[PDB]
Scaffold this active site. Structure first.
Site, mmCIF file in Angstrom:
data_model
loop_
_atom_site.group_PDB
_atom_site.id
_atom_site.type_symbol
_atom_site.label_atom_id
_atom_site.label_comp_id
_atom_site.label_asym_id
_atom_site.label_seq_id
_atom_site.Cartn_x
_atom_site.Cartn_y
_atom_site.Cartn_z
ATOM 1 N N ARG A 16 -9.735 2.335 -60.203
ATOM 2 C CA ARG A 16 -11.232 1.925 -60.082
ATOM 3 C C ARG A 16 -11.745 2.502 -58.970
ATOM 4 O O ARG A 16 -12.907 3.266 -59.001
ATOM 5 C CB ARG A 16 -11.545 0.469 -60.421
ATOM 6 C CG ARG A 16 -12.872 0.001 -60.667
ATOM 7 C CD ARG A 16 -12.945 -1.401 -60.959
ATOM 8 N NE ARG A 16 -12.445 -1.496 -62.318
ATOM 9 C CZ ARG A 16 -11.438 -2.476 -62.600
ATOM 10 N NH1 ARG A 16 -10.977 -3.445 -61.652
ATOM 11 N NH2 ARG A 16 -10.834 -2.661 -63.803
ATOM 12 N N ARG A 157 -10.726 15.193 -60.258
ATOM 13 C CA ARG A 157 -11.304 14.134 -61.017
ATOM 14 C C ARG A 157 -11.097 14.004 -62.391
ATOM 15 O O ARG A 157 -10.282 13.001 -62.964
ATOM 16 C CB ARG A 157 -12.804 13.998 -60.768
ATOM 17 C CG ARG A 157 -13.602 12.843 -60.991
ATOM 18 C CD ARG A 157 -13.909 12.663 -62.757
ATOM 19 N NE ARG A 157 -12.987 11.902 -63.564
ATOM 20 C CZ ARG A 157 -13.300 10.595 -63.710
ATOM 21 N NH1 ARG A 157 -14.676 10.241 -63.369
ATOM 22 N NH2 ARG A 157 -12.594 10.028 -64.457
ATOM 23 N N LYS A 168 -4.717 2.715 -68.870
ATOM 24 C CA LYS A 168 -5.110 1.783 -69.838
ATOM 25 C C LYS A 168 -4.195 1.575 -71.149
ATOM 26 O O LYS A 168 -4.013 0.339 -71.571
ATOM 27 C CB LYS A 168 -6.727 2.551 -70.353
ATOM 28 C CG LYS A 168 -7.553 2.353 -69.507
ATOM 29 C CD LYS A 168 -8.767 2.957 -70.436
ATOM 30 C CE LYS A 168 -10.021 2.905 -69.280
ATOM 31 N NZ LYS A 168 -9.858 3.753 -68.131
ATOM 32 N N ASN A 194 -17.092 0.978 -70.940
ATOM 33 C CA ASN A 194 -17.954 0.174 -71.123
ATOM 34 C C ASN A 194 -19.345 0.492 -70.599
ATOM 35 O O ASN A 194 -19.652 0.614 -69.642
ATOM 36 C CB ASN A 194 -17.664 -1.279 -70.496
ATOM 37 C CG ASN A 194 -18.886 -2.450 -70.420
ATOM 38 O OD1 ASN A 194 -19.459 -2.330 -71.272
ATOM 39 N ND2 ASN A 194 -18.373 -3.288 -69.883
ATOM 40 N N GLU A 198 -20.511 1.384 -66.971
ATOM 41 C CA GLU A 198 -20.826 3.153 -66.563
ATOM 42 C C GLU A 198 -21.861 3.283 -65.921
ATOM 43 O O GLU A 198 -22.246 4.232 -64.878
ATOM 44 C CB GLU A 198 -20.456 3.918 -68.037
ATOM 45 C CG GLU A 198 -20.482 5.356 -67.867
ATOM 46 C CD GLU A 198 -20.891 6.247 -68.868
ATOM 47 O OE1 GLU A 198 -19.717 6.599 -69.518
ATOM 48 O OE2 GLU A 198 -21.935 6.639 -69.270
ATOM 49 N N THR A 233 -14.399 14.634 -68.964
ATOM 50 C CA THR A 233 -13.462 13.545 -68.563
ATOM 51 C C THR A 233 -12.892 12.804 -69.640
ATOM 52 O O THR A 233 -11.666 12.684 -69.722
ATOM 53 C CB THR A 233 -14.298 12.420 -67.830
ATOM 54 O OG1 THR A 233 -14.624 13.131 -66.516
ATOM 55 C CG2 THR A 233 -13.351 11.507 -67.384
ATOM 56 N N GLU A 237 -8.887 12.190 -71.790
ATOM 57 C CA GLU A 237 -8.443 10.837 -72.231
ATOM 58 C C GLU A 237 -7.889 10.622 -73.835
ATOM 59 O O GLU A 237 -6.575 10.291 -73.960
ATOM 60 C CB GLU A 237 -9.461 9.721 -71.801
ATOM 61 C CG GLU A 237 -9.632 9.325 -70.478
ATOM 62 C CD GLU A 237 -10.459 8.373 -70.132
ATOM 63 O OE1 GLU A 237 -10.148 7.041 -70.152
ATOM 64 O OE2 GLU A 237 -11.675 8.679 -69.855
#
Ligand SMILES: N[C@@H](Cc1ccc(O)cc1)C(=O)O
Ligand SMILES: N[C@@H](Cc1ccc(O)cc1)C(=O)O
EC number: 5.4.99.5
Lengths: 245, 245
Positions: A16, A157, A168, A194, A198, A233, A237
Site C-alpha cells: 500500500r 509500477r 491479495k 475499492n 481508489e 495496471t 492483475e
C-alpha cells in the site's frame, strides 16, 4: 518492504505504501516531460537523421538500450523489482549476486507488458502532455532522457501488480479460488479495487502534482493517469490471477 | 530560458524560476537517499571487496564515471548547464553539436567546484541524512545511483551561480565594478542576497519537502541544506565576480 523477505513483500500495508511511492513518481515524471515539445523524430523508427551505425529502431530505442546496459552492471535488473526493455543487451554485474526467494508463481515472467507500455506512452500519453507539437532538435537528448525515466517509472509500477495480486490472492485464498475457477473477470475486478479508496488515492495524487510543479492542470493530469495508465495496471492483475491454479 | 539565447539566460526572473526548479530537486534527492544506511564501503577508496579490474577509487567513483560516459553520447555534457565529475572519460555524441553563444567570462571554466561538492556530500551530508550507519550490502547499487543523482543535482545548481552572478553584475555594472575593485567580499555578499527573500524561499522549500515525502523533519532538512549547501553556492559567486575585470 524487502524483496529478500517474502512476508514483508506479501504484507498489504507495505505494498500500500510502496505504490504511494511508485505512483507519485509517474506523476512527477509526466510533469517533467510536459516541458518539452512532442519531438516525433525521437520516436520515428530507424532514427531518420541520426547517423547511428547499423542501428535500426528509433533514437529513443538507442538511448534507452544504451542506458539500460550501463545501469545493469550495478545489479539494477536482478531485483524482482525491475523488468528491462531490452533484456538481450543488459550486461552482468561485478557485484555479488543476491538470493531473492521465490514469492510469485513460476509463470510470472511470462506476464510481461513492456511493449504495450511504451506503445501507449508514445502514441497516447506524449500527444497529451507535451508543451506543443514539433521537433525540438536542441533538446532531443534532454527529452529522450525524460522518456527513459517515464518508461522506467511506468514499468516498475505496472509490473508490481503481480506482487499486489499475489498478496491479495494469498490474503483470501477461499475467495479468489472461486472467482478464478469460474474465470470471472469482473468478480476479480471488483474485489481487487475499492472505488472509495481508489478515489482518495487520486485526490491525494492531485494535491501532490500541484505542490510539485505544473496548460496542464493538476486534476487534468491525474485523469490522464486514471484513464490511460490505471487500466493497464489491472490487466496485469487479472491475467496473473486467472492462470494461478 | 534557453542557453542559445543570452538575453533569456541573463534575465533575472528567468533564473529566479530556474533555481526554484533546481533547488526543489536537491531536496527531493536528499529525501530519496535518506531511506538508505550510510554504506561506508560505497565510498571507501579502492573499492575494498569489489573485484573491479585495476580500477582505483571508491565504488561510487566507478559507478558515477560509468554512468557519465553513458549520458555523454546524447550531448548531456555540452550544455553550459552541465559540468562532469570525470571529464577525462566522457565520450562524444553521434548527434549534431549545438552552438552555444558565449555568455560568461572566458575564465569561467577555471571556477570549478566539483571535487569540493562531493567531499562535503560524502563527509558532511551523508552522515546526517542516512537512515542509520553501516553497510547495506543488498543495496550498494540502489544507494550508489542515489548519490550519483544527488551529486548531479548539487553540481548543476551550484555551478549555475556563474550565470546567477553574471546576470547580477550586468544588471548593475556601476555598483559591482566598485565593490569588485575594492575586493570587498562582504559588500558583494550583501548585494547578491536579500535575507527577506532568501527566507521566503526556504519557507517555500520546507512546504515542498513535507508534501513530497519524508527521523528527518522537513524543517531540519531545509537547515541541512541552508547550512552546508548554501555557503558553497555563494563561494562560486564571489570567486567569479572578483576576477571579473
Ligand atoms: N539538452 C541537451 C543536453 C542534455 C542531454 C541529455 C541530458 O540528460 C541532459 C542534457 C541535449 O538534449 O542535447
Ligand atoms: N537494489 C539492487 C538493485 C538495483 C541497483 C541499482 C539501481 O539503480 C536499482 C536497483 C542493488 O543495489 O543491487
Amino acid at each position: 518492504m524487502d524483496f529478500t523477505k517474502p512476508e514483508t513483500v506479501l504484507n498489504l500495508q507495505n505494498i500500500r505504501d510502496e505504490l504511494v511511492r511508485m505512483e507519485d513518481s509517474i506523476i512527477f515524471k509526466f510533469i517533467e516531460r510536459s516541458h518539452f515539445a512532442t519531438c516525433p523524430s525521437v520516436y520515428e523508427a530507424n532514427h531518420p537523421g541520426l547517423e547511428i551505425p547499423n542501428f535500426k529502431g528509433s533514437f529513443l530505442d538507442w538511448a534507452l538500450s544504451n542506458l539500460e546496459i550501463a545501469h545493469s552492471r550495478i545489479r539494477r535488473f536482478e531485483s524482482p523489482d525491475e523488468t528491462p526493455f531490452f533484456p538481450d543487451k543488459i550486461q552482468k554485474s561485478f557485484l555479488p549476486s543476491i538470493n531473492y526467494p521465490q514469492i510469485l508463481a513460476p509463470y510470472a515472467p511470462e506476464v510481461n507488458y513492456n511493449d504495450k507500455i511504451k506503445k501507449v506512452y508514445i502514441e497516447k500519453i506524449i500527444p497529451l502532455i507535451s508543451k506543443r507539437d514539433g521537433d525540438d532538435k536542441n533538446n532531443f537528448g534532454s527529452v529522450a532522457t525524460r522518456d527513459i525515466e517515464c518508461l522506467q517509472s511506468l514499468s516498475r509500477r505496472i509490473h508490481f501488480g503481480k506482487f499486489v495480486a499475489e498478496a491479495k490472492f494469498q490474503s483470501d485464498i477461499p475467495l479468489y479460488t472461486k472467482l478464478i475457477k469460474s474465470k470471472d473477470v469482473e468478480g476479480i475486478m471488483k474485489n481487487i479495487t475499492n472505488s472509495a479508496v481508489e478515489e482518495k488515492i487520486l485526490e491525494r495524487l492531485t494535491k501532490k502534482a500541484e505542490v510539485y510543479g505544473v496548460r496542464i492542470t493538476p486534476e487534468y493530469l491525474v485523469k490522464i493517469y486514471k484513464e490511460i495508465v490505471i487500466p493497464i495496471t489491472k490487466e496485469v492483475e487479472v491475467e496473473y490471477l486467472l492462470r494461478r491454479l
